[PDB]
Amino acid sequence: SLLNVPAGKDLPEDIYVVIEIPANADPIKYEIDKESGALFVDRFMSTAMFYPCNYGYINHTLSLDGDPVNVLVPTPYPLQPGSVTRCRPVGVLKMTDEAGEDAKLVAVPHSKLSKEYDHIKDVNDLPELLKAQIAHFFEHYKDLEKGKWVKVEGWENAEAAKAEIVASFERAKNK
Amino acid sequence: SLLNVPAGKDLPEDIYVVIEIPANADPIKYEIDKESGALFVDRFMSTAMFYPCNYGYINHTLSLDGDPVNVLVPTPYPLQPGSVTRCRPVGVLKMTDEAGEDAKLVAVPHSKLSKEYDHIKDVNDLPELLKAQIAHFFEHYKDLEKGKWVKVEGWENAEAAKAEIVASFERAKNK
Amino acid sequence: SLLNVPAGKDLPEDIYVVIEIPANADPIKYEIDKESGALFVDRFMSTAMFYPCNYGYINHTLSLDGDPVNVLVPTPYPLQPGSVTRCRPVGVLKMTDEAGEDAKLVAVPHSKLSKEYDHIKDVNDLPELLKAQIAHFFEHYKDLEKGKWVKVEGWENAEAAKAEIVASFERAKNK
Amino acid sequence: SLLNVPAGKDLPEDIYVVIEIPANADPIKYEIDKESGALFVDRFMSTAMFYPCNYGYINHTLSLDGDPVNVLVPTPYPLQPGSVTRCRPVGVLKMTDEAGEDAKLVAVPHSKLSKEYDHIKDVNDLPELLKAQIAHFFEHYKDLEKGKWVKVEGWENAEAAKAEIVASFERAKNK
Amino acid sequence: SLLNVPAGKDLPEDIYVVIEIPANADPIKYEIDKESGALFVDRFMSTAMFYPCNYGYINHTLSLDGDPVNVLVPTPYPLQPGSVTRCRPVGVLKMTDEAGEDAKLVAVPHSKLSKEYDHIKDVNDLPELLKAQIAHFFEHYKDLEKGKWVKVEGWENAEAAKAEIVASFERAKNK
Amino acid sequence: SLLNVPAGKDLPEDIYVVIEIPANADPIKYEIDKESGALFVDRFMSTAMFYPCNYGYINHTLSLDGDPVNVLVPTPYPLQPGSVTRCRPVGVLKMTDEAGEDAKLVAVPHSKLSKEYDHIKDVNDLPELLKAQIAHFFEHYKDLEKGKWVKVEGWENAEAAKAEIVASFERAKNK
């Protein structure tokens, strides 16, 4: 029951990300349906691009855009869809699309799971190649879709990311 | 909760297919257990064949054969097991086995998901190679199983497929 | 709902194993969270090893170590995570770690699913190469993890395995 | 070896394409070394894109960019690197990169290999999606490479492609 | 290159098999070009079947079908195309196709490579499943190919296989 | 062919590595046959381990173990067997096996191929995890092979690696 997974052990620095799409996956956009807790296909992108890292959501959050908060999680190996990963937020990729807000958080595995990300404390600590690859992916994977687009704005720090988690958690908690 | 996924947005022309087996999967027959909503292994086929396309079921349907209605869904890339795909029915592959009825519906992704199947309105619009590959797969994947077989009868149109969806939906709705 | 899957059709000789990790998977240790029925990432191992066979648990069991009873299931092809496989227990791999008991049961697909394991009645019937590969995997996959280790003790017969299933089933049934 | 392979059975209508990169390969750009007849790694691209179809060359040809003529070949399943495919040229994607000419022809498997492309006689017969995908891939796969770029001029017909095969074949012979 | 490889260390008991197609490969039939020593795509099969084991040839041999002797080789993991495996012939699958003779020998890896097949001394020692799978694959992989067919006469012993290796080896030498 | 490839552009700082085994490959140990220039299967390991990175050799070299110098090369994506990668040697893993010398150098892709390793100038610059993973893999992949063993003496610097490239290059020339 994905629907009974906690938002985190100690929000907002210690969170749980439920994986929707694994790293290196084909360009099929999936989305969690909170009514059923089932993953629905959104769209089969026409571009020849693959997901640069894992993509999931924080359960029990309500982003202003209506969906839970989405998170990009880089890992040693691709994660199983539906698995829950303990992470630590490090930044946010600010973007917009024809529909409005589309920011995505970036988080790294918690030290209990792996020791290789212990030194990534903020968005500026992530490899420059990884950040460029992620931003490029989002800017272009919808290129061949008519009436759809994505404008990538920039990166924001961990503090920005944490503000968003606590705000979205409360936005569903008290509502 | 696969069990809370609707049968469709607008039956029978607009349905939801819950994927059980992805396209190109190894010859392991899986089946949904409606008691638990969990996928159980049915049999490991001994033939060297792979699934020609995705295989799923329409939730909230009761085929006369006892199970939900099964659907074959061809896609640009293989779908994740347990994901829900919005489709449009285009035909049916009539078959029987030692146990009785074994017809399988064929449906294509809804236009909202992809624009490449918009021109496939009926079973006769599907590529002739695809239809031959699907029929051949079902006729032969159980070849090396003792006391089991499949006799493929032929293809029926979208109207036949739609009659089956509404009949099976009601057969579980009012029962 | 993995949580509603029966422990077995006829315990302890006829059981159901819910798959957590498929055969040949990368070294990411997953674990079932019985609160949510969701799979959580435990650890990303640093070794260059892969799972020699499928790894799952028997639902409705309570091993003394706190978790459900874990089972290793060898199959013709890798199983889908979350799928339920009907098996017959044939032995147990006795092991310990820094945390205590860590025995893992070994079971083969039930004859209804496949006929290739019908002649494996006990732990001594399994291929000698398979047993060595499994024991070696467990002895070494945690090698590069600080403060963690596994000491593989030896193999025990089907009778030992069956005693453990009935004991663990009752340990959760009457508690 | 791969240097004893003809440019074709009957240039320019009947050609042989030696595969260098399989369809769906990761973004590692390879280049044939004319002297060794060995495949050299040229560059690891930083974008998250995969090769939209098989990429190869016509042996015994020398295009303006100094390498043999390169050909993109669509197939049902990805081809093995180094295998030779009998094809029919159907068009060319005109482009220039930071170094000069960079045209890629497009050829389909010969009818003896598969009837599936028998109808593709010219550039306008190819699927619009595939053409969009190929152009988009070449337009952007080098986006994150400093100093590297690709200007896409557009598609040209079978006749333009056949003229390049003839000119390039003679350019390698009359040398 | 691959043309400087011996037919074997000690024909016909000790042979070398150059791999053309890996175990589990898609249904693309390849054929070695004797003059180039290059692998040519021969046909894309339309059936949904995969190669049951590694498929190769004995260099410096010429069977009746005009190609070198072909050998099927079972292994723990699929082999790389072009690699040379030291084997022991254990049998032959007698067949004829639309063109004439079409026998395939079966060889197991030599004891220096793996002890796992040391007990397989003859055709009757091979697993019944594997033999069933191989025959079924050759009986049906060309089912959807117009004008193409395969008549399977049956299995023959190691002696029959060794006689073909000797005759084919001499047929290429005394030419 | 692969025998017409230079040992390097400027030994020992600028070398070419011909790939034999891709990163993440199954435990099948291959060995280059100097006379054929063909890859021979040497042994199927029984341990459940995968190659931690690409494994190759420097053409026109002859190390003490009788084979050309072997090199481990880390890359963003696994390389194709037989492709040639321009590298920079950065260290050597000193080891001995049951037969004698068994050192493996470590080289990183040249800056023309990727900027990603430009900072790796010496052995101590490589990630500690990767080095741990490589040593652990060589220490244990032959554990289940009777009579086979590997003693790992430790890492050595770029200078030690360059001295071996020079000595091995001359040992093959002055022969």
Side-chain angles (χ1 to χ4, degrees), chain B residues 53-71:
Chain B
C53 57
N54 307 282
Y55 183 97
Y57 64 96
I58 300 172
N59 196 29
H60 298 312
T61 55
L62 184 54
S63 189
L64 280 171
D65 84 328
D67 304 269
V69 168
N70 294 105
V71 199

PDB file of all heavy atoms in Angstrom, chain B residues 53-71:
ATOM      1  N   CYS B  53       3.486  -8.605 -27.151  1.00  0.00           N
ATOM      2  CA  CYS B  53       3.025  -7.293 -26.748  1.00  0.00           C
ATOM      3  C   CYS B  53       2.622  -7.373 -25.285  1.00  0.00           C
ATOM      4  O   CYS B  53       2.777  -8.427 -24.676  1.00  0.00           O
ATOM      5  CB  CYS B  53       1.857  -6.853 -27.637  1.00  0.00           C
ATOM      6  SG  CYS B  53       0.485  -8.017 -27.622  1.00  0.00           S
ATOM      7  N   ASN B  54       2.159  -6.259 -24.713  1.00  0.00           N
ATOM      8  CA  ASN B  54       1.740  -6.219 -23.319  1.00  0.00           C
ATOM      9  C   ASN B  54       0.446  -6.988 -23.139  1.00  0.00           C
ATOM     10  O   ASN B  54      -0.386  -7.028 -24.042  1.00  0.00           O
ATOM     11  CB  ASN B  54       1.556  -4.782 -22.845  1.00  0.00           C
ATOM     12  CG  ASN B  54       2.771  -3.932 -23.101  1.00  0.00           C
ATOM     13  OD1 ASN B  54       3.773  -3.999 -22.381  1.00  0.00           O
ATOM     14  ND2 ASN B  54       2.700  -3.138 -24.139  1.00  0.00           N
ATOM     15  N   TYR B  55       0.251  -7.531 -21.943  1.00  0.00           N
ATOM     16  CA  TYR B  55      -0.923  -8.333 -21.619  1.00  0.00           C
ATOM     17  C   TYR B  55      -1.468  -7.855 -20.281  1.00  0.00           C
ATOM     18  O   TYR B  55      -0.735  -7.817 -19.301  1.00  0.00           O
ATOM     19  CB  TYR B  55      -0.476  -9.794 -21.512  1.00  0.00           C
ATOM     20  CG  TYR B  55      -1.564 -10.795 -21.258  1.00  0.00           C
ATOM     21  CD1 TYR B  55      -2.138 -11.509 -22.311  1.00  0.00           C
ATOM     22  CD2 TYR B  55      -1.981 -11.081 -19.964  1.00  0.00           C
ATOM     23  CE1 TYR B  55      -3.101 -12.493 -22.078  1.00  0.00           C
ATOM     24  CE2 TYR B  55      -2.940 -12.062 -19.718  1.00  0.00           C
ATOM     25  CZ  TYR B  55      -3.492 -12.764 -20.777  1.00  0.00           C
ATOM     26  OH  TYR B  55      -4.406 -13.756 -20.536  1.00  0.00           O
ATOM     27  N   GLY B  56      -2.742  -7.496 -20.233  1.00  0.00           N
ATOM     28  CA  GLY B  56      -3.316  -7.020 -18.994  1.00  0.00           C
ATOM     29  C   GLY B  56      -4.766  -7.443 -18.897  1.00  0.00           C
ATOM     30  O   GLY B  56      -5.189  -8.343 -19.621  1.00  0.00           O
ATOM     31  N   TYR B  57      -5.515  -6.824 -17.985  1.00  0.00           N
ATOM     32  CA  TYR B  57      -6.941  -7.125 -17.769  1.00  0.00           C
ATOM     33  C   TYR B  57      -7.713  -5.830 -17.530  1.00  0.00           C
ATOM     34  O   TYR B  57      -7.113  -4.790 -17.234  1.00  0.00           O
ATOM     35  CB  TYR B  57      -7.143  -8.081 -16.556  1.00  0.00           C
ATOM     36  CG  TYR B  57      -6.731  -7.520 -15.196  1.00  0.00           C
ATOM     37  CD1 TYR B  57      -7.668  -6.924 -14.346  1.00  0.00           C
ATOM     38  CD2 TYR B  57      -5.395  -7.562 -14.770  1.00  0.00           C
ATOM     39  CE1 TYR B  57      -7.284  -6.377 -13.114  1.00  0.00           C
ATOM     40  CE2 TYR B  57      -5.007  -7.029 -13.543  1.00  0.00           C
ATOM     41  CZ  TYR B  57      -5.953  -6.437 -12.720  1.00  0.00           C
ATOM     42  OH  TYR B  57      -5.580  -5.909 -11.500  1.00  0.00           O
ATOM     43  N   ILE B  58      -9.036  -5.889 -17.673  1.00  0.00           N
ATOM     44  CA  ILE B  58      -9.875  -4.727 -17.404  1.00  0.00           C
ATOM     45  C   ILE B  58     -10.431  -5.002 -16.019  1.00  0.00           C
ATOM     46  O   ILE B  58     -11.057  -6.036 -15.795  1.00  0.00           O
ATOM     47  CB  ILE B  58     -11.045  -4.589 -18.394  1.00  0.00           C
ATOM     48  CG1 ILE B  58     -10.522  -4.444 -19.822  1.00  0.00           C
ATOM     49  CG2 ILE B  58     -11.862  -3.349 -18.058  1.00  0.00           C
ATOM     50  CD1 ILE B  58     -11.606  -4.499 -20.883  1.00  0.00           C
ATOM     51  N   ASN B  59     -10.155  -4.117 -15.070  1.00  0.00           N
ATOM     52  CA  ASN B  59     -10.647  -4.317 -13.720  1.00  0.00           C
ATOM     53  C   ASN B  59     -12.170  -4.189 -13.722  1.00  0.00           C
ATOM     54  O   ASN B  59     -12.733  -3.493 -14.560  1.00  0.00           O
ATOM     55  CB  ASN B  59     -10.031  -3.272 -12.787  1.00  0.00           C
ATOM     56  CG  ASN B  59     -10.189  -3.635 -11.323  1.00  0.00           C
ATOM     57  OD1 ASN B  59     -10.258  -4.811 -10.966  1.00  0.00           O
ATOM     58  ND2 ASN B  59     -10.257  -2.633 -10.471  1.00  0.00           N
ATOM     59  N   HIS B  60     -12.834  -4.846 -12.774  1.00  0.00           N
ATOM     60  CA  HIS B  60     -14.296  -4.788 -12.655  1.00  0.00           C
ATOM     61  C   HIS B  60     -15.041  -5.449 -13.811  1.00  0.00           C
ATOM     62  O   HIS B  60     -16.092  -4.972 -14.236  1.00  0.00           O
ATOM     63  CB  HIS B  60     -14.802  -3.340 -12.523  1.00  0.00           C
ATOM     64  CG  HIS B  60     -14.305  -2.623 -11.306  1.00  0.00           C
ATOM     65  ND1 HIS B  60     -14.348  -3.169 -10.042  1.00  0.00           N
ATOM     66  CD2 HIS B  60     -13.775  -1.387 -11.162  1.00  0.00           C
ATOM     67  CE1 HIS B  60     -13.867  -2.302  -9.172  1.00  0.00           C
ATOM     68  NE2 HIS B  60     -13.513  -1.212  -9.825  1.00  0.00           N
ATOM     69  N   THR B  61     -14.464  -6.499 -14.375  1.00  0.00           N
ATOM     70  CA  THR B  61     -15.135  -7.207 -15.447  1.00  0.00           C
ATOM     71  C   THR B  61     -15.124  -8.650 -15.048  1.00  0.00           C
ATOM     72  O   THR B  61     -14.279  -9.085 -14.264  1.00  0.00           O
ATOM     73  CB  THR B  61     -14.451  -7.072 -16.839  1.00  0.00           C
ATOM     74  OG1 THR B  61     -13.076  -7.480 -16.757  1.00  0.00           O
ATOM     75  CG2 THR B  61     -14.573  -5.643 -17.373  1.00  0.00           C
ATOM     76  N   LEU B  62     -16.091  -9.387 -15.559  1.00  0.00           N
ATOM     77  CA  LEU B  62     -16.176 -10.791 -15.257  1.00  0.00           C
ATOM     78  C   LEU B  62     -16.473 -11.500 -16.551  1.00  0.00           C
ATOM     79  O   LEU B  62     -17.574 -11.423 -17.083  1.00  0.00           O
ATOM     80  CB  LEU B  62     -17.267 -11.050 -14.214  1.00  0.00           C
ATOM     81  CG  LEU B  62     -17.374 -12.505 -13.764  1.00  0.00           C
ATOM     82  CD1 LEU B  62     -16.012 -12.989 -13.287  1.00  0.00           C
ATOM     83  CD2 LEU B  62     -18.433 -12.648 -12.674  1.00  0.00           C
ATOM     84  N   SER B  63     -15.430 -12.059 -17.132  1.00  0.00           N
ATOM     85  CA  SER B  63     -15.565 -12.799 -18.362  1.00  0.00           C
ATOM     86  C   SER B  63     -16.325 -14.058 -17.948  1.00  0.00           C
ATOM     87  O   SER B  63     -16.344 -14.425 -16.769  1.00  0.00           O
ATOM     88  CB  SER B  63     -14.173 -13.145 -18.896  1.00  0.00           C
ATOM     89  OG  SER B  63     -14.217 -13.695 -20.197  1.00  0.00           O
ATOM     90  N   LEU B  64     -17.019 -14.684 -18.889  1.00  0.00           N
ATOM     91  CA  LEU B  64     -17.741 -15.906 -18.564  1.00  0.00           C
ATOM     92  C   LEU B  64     -16.760 -16.972 -18.060  1.00  0.00           C
ATOM     93  O   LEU B  64     -17.084 -17.734 -17.143  1.00  0.00           O
ATOM     94  CB  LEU B  64     -18.507 -16.412 -19.779  1.00  0.00           C
ATOM     95  CG  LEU B  64     -19.830 -15.685 -20.007  1.00  0.00           C
ATOM     96  CD1 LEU B  64     -20.415 -16.100 -21.350  1.00  0.00           C
ATOM     97  CD2 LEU B  64     -20.803 -15.974 -18.852  1.00  0.00           C
ATOM     98  N   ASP B  65     -15.537 -16.961 -18.604  1.00  0.00           N
ATOM     99  CA  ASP B  65     -14.497 -17.915 -18.215  1.00  0.00           C
ATOM    100  C   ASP B  65     -14.034 -17.767 -16.756  1.00  0.00           C
ATOM    101  O   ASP B  65     -13.093 -18.449 -16.324  1.00  0.00           O
ATOM    102  CB  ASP B  65     -13.298 -17.878 -19.202  1.00  0.00           C
ATOM    103  CG  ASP B  65     -12.266 -16.771 -18.895  1.00  0.00           C
ATOM    104  OD1 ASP B  65     -12.635 -15.689 -18.392  1.00  0.00           O
ATOM    105  OD2 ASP B  65     -11.065 -16.987 -19.187  1.00  0.00           O
ATOM    106  N   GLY B  66     -14.682 -16.858 -16.021  1.00  0.00           N
ATOM    107  CA  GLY B  66     -14.365 -16.630 -14.619  1.00  0.00           C
ATOM    108  C   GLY B  66     -13.414 -15.492 -14.281  1.00  0.00           C
ATOM    109  O   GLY B  66     -13.538 -14.884 -13.220  1.00  0.00           O
ATOM    110  N   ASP B  67     -12.463 -15.208 -15.167  1.00  0.00           N
ATOM    111  CA  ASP B  67     -11.473 -14.149 -14.950  1.00  0.00           C
ATOM    112  C   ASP B  67     -11.922 -12.805 -15.507  1.00  0.00           C
ATOM    113  O   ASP B  67     -13.007 -12.686 -16.067  1.00  0.00           O
ATOM    114  CB  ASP B  67     -10.164 -14.512 -15.666  1.00  0.00           C
ATOM    115  CG  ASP B  67      -9.606 -15.850 -15.235  1.00  0.00           C
ATOM    116  OD1 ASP B  67      -8.798 -15.878 -14.273  1.00  0.00           O
ATOM    117  OD2 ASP B  67      -9.966 -16.866 -15.877  1.00  0.00           O
ATOM    118  N   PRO B  68     -11.126 -11.752 -15.284  1.00  0.00           N
ATOM    119  CA  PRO B  68     -11.539 -10.464 -15.845  1.00  0.00           C
ATOM    120  C   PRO B  68     -11.282 -10.597 -17.358  1.00  0.00           C
ATOM    121  O   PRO B  68     -10.718 -11.600 -17.814  1.00  0.00           O
ATOM    122  CB  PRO B  68     -10.542  -9.483 -15.218  1.00  0.00           C
ATOM    123  CG  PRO B  68     -10.150 -10.144 -13.945  1.00  0.00           C
ATOM    124  CD  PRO B  68      -9.991 -11.577 -14.361  1.00  0.00           C
ATOM    125  N   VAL B  69     -11.707  -9.624 -18.144  1.00  0.00           N
ATOM    126  CA  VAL B  69     -11.461  -9.704 -19.573  1.00  0.00           C
ATOM    127  C   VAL B  69      -9.977  -9.396 -19.783  1.00  0.00           C
ATOM    128  O   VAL B  69      -9.463  -8.453 -19.202  1.00  0.00           O
ATOM    129  CB  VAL B  69     -12.327  -8.683 -20.346  1.00  0.00           C
ATOM    130  CG1 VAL B  69     -11.849  -8.561 -21.783  1.00  0.00           C
ATOM    131  CG2 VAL B  69     -13.790  -9.109 -20.326  1.00  0.00           C
ATOM    132  N   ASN B  70      -9.289 -10.216 -20.573  1.00  0.00           N
ATOM    133  CA  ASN B  70      -7.877 -10.009 -20.866  1.00  0.00           C
ATOM    134  C   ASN B  70      -7.707  -9.244 -22.157  1.00  0.00           C
ATOM    135  O   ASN B  70      -8.452  -9.461 -23.119  1.00  0.00           O
ATOM    136  CB  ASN B  70      -7.133 -11.330 -20.944  1.00  0.00           C
ATOM    137  CG  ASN B  70      -7.089 -12.044 -19.610  1.00  0.00           C
ATOM    138  OD1 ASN B  70      -7.808 -13.017 -19.404  1.00  0.00           O
ATOM    139  ND2 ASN B  70      -6.260 -11.551 -18.684  1.00  0.00           N
ATOM    140  N   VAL B  71      -6.698  -8.375 -22.180  1.00  0.00           N
ATOM    141  CA  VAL B  71      -6.419  -7.508 -23.328  1.00  0.00           C
ATOM    142  C   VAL B  71      -4.947  -7.484 -23.705  1.00  0.00           C
ATOM    143  O   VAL B  71      -4.074  -7.389 -22.833  1.00  0.00           O
ATOM    144  CB  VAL B  71      -6.806  -6.032 -23.011  1.00  0.00           C
ATOM    145  CG1 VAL B  71      -6.976  -5.216 -24.286  1.00  0.00           C
ATOM    146  CG2 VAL B  71      -8.069  -5.978 -22.184  1.00  0.00           C
TER     147      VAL B  71
END
